[PDB]
Amino acid sequence: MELIRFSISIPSKLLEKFDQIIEEIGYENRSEAIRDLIRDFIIRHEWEVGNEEVAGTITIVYNHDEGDVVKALLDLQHEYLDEIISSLHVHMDEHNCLEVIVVKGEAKKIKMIADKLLSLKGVKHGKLVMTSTGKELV
Amino acid sequence: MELIRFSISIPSKLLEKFDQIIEEIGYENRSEAIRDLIRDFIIRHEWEVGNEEVAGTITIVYNHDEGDVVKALLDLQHEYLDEIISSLHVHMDEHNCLEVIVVKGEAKKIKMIADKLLSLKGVKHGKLVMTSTGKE
Amino acid sequence: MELIRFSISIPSKLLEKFDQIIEEIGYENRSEAIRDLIRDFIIRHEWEVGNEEVAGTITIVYNHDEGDVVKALLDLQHEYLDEIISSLHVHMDEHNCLEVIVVKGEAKKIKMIADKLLSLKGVKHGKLVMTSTGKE
C-alpha cells in the first residue's frame, strides 16, 4: 500500500459549492468525495476503451398486461445467458412491474443488451447503470 | 481569491490510472480534470426531483472486507424499512460485492436515502435510478 | 373395492427415467412407486401450520415457453401484492427459468398462495419454505 499526496487548485466558488453539497449528501469530507469522483471517472473510461470486464444494472418498468412485452423481455434475456446474472422483480400495482437486471461482461455487449431491452415498446421507463466489478478499483 | 489550493491523499494505483487517462484526453494537469469532475458532480446533484411517488434502484459496489461498510449498509437500510423493498446481492470475487436496492416512496426521501448509501465510507461506486411507475 | 385402476399419459422421456429409477430401487411395478409418492405427498400436505405471522420463499422452475405459465404466474402474483415482497429470477438455459418469490403474512394465506403457484400448469417443480422470524 502506498498513499500519494498531491495538491490541486480549484476555483474558489466552485469549491465552496462542492463542499456545501457533499456535506448535505452525507460525505464526511472533501477527500472522500473527490476520490469517489476519480473512481467514477475511471469506471466510465473502462466502459469506453478496452475489453475488460465491467458490471451494470438495467432497471425497467412495464405493464405486464400490455402487448407482448413480458414474452419479449424473457426472449431477449435468455439470449444473453452469459452476461445476465439474475433479475429482481417487484410488483408495483395490479398492472405495473419494476424489474432490475444485473449484468456482467464486456461493455459493448452490455450496452447492446440495454439498447434492446429499453427500445421495447412495452418498456415505459428504463436505465442502464454502468459500474464496476470492483476488481480493478481500490 | 480565484483559486483555492489544497491537498489530497490517494492510493497510488488509483492515481496512476487517473493520470494515464487524463494525459490521453489532453489535460494539462490534475486540477483541470478534477475541476471538471466537480462541476459535473454539482450539476448532476442540483437537478430537482420533486416529491411525487417514485420507485427506484440503488446500485452499489464495495469490498465487503473494507472498514465497516457491511455493517453501516445494513444499519442504514434497516432504518428505512418502509422505503426499502428488497436488495439483490452478487458476489463478484473474493472481496467485491455488487448490490442493488429496490426502493419506493416520496422522491425527496428516496433521494435522501440514496445519498446516504452512496456516500457511505467503503462504497466504491454507485448510482440511483428513480422513475415514476406511470406512463412513458 | 380395495384398488382403483386408472390411466395416465406421460411424456416418454419422463417415463423412461422414472422406470430406470424404480427398477434399481427394487420396485416390482409402477403402481407401488406411485402409491408411495402419493402417500408421502398426502402426509406432507396434512401437517398444520397455524396462522401466526410468517416469512417465506417459494422456489419454482419452469419452461417460460410452455403454455401460459409466465402470464399465469404474473397474474396470480399481482393478485397478492400485500404478501409478495419481491421475486428473484435466474435464466438457467434457453428455455428454463428458476424463480424465488419472497413472501410475508399469515401462515394460512401464505400456504394457500404457495399452493396455487406450485400447482399452476407449466410449473415443473417447486417448494415452499415458511419460517417464523423469531428465535430458533
Place this chain on the structure above:
Amino acid sequence: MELIRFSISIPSKLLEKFDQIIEEIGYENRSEAIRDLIRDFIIRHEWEVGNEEVAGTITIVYNHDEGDVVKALLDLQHEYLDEIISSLHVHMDEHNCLEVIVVKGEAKKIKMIADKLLSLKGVKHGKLVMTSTGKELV
C-alpha cells in the same frame, strides 16, 4: 414428442384422499399432480446419484446485529463464487433479515454449502430447497 399411456392401481381410500387434497391445493386434475410427483421423485434421485448439475435455494433468517453472523455469511458465500449465483435480502424488522441464496452446480457441493451456512450460530432458521435446472425435465 411421444406420450405413453399406462394404467396403475392405487388403494381406493388413498386415491380418494389424494383427489380431495390436490383439488384443495389448486391442481386441475389427478394426472397433472401425479406427473409432478414423478418429476419431484426424479429430481431427488438427481441429488442422490451422479454428478449432473442441479439447482437449489437456501433460505435463512438471522439477526444481523448478533455476533459475527453477517461477516461469517459473506466469507462463506464468497468462498463459493462458482456455485452461488446471487442472493435476495429482505429486511424483516429492525434486527432481523431474511435472505435467500440461489445456487447451481454439483449436488454434493451445494449440500456442503448449505451445511456450512445453516450450522452458523447466528442463523436462526434455514432450509435448503433441492430442485432442478429444468434441462433434464419435461
